[PDB]
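Please decode residue identities from the backbone states below.
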């Protein structure tokens, strides 16, 4: 299945929403540019699941398929200092 994660929270915070999500191995994660762009996504240790290019427009989406079970930490480079970090748990 495909699950969506917003980049920039609906309440205006610099955060991914939901900040922690659990999925099944083989599922696809879609990040959607919501508010306070630009944003990007770097998945720690996983260059192949990362999207370093900045996303500027609202609605811009990009995705990654997580085939290996485990816990993955990811962050936004522009806003890492503001705590824009997330977690994906793959079951
Ligand atoms: Cu950001």
């Amino acid at each position: 299945q495909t699950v969506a994660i917003k980049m920039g929270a609906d309440n205006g915070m610099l955060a991914f929403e939901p900040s922690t999500i659990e999925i099944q191995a083989g599922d696809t994660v879609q990040w959607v540019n919501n508010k306070l762009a630009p944003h990007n996504v770097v998945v720690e240790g996983q260059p192949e699941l990362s999207h370093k290019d900045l996303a500027f427009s609202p609605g811009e989406t990009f995705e990654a398929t997580f085939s290996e079970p485990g816990t993955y930490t990811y962050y936004c480079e522009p806003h890492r200092g503001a705590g824009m970090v997330g977690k994906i748990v793959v079951q």
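Observation: The domain at 1-91 is CATH 2.60.40.420 (Immunoglobulin-like).
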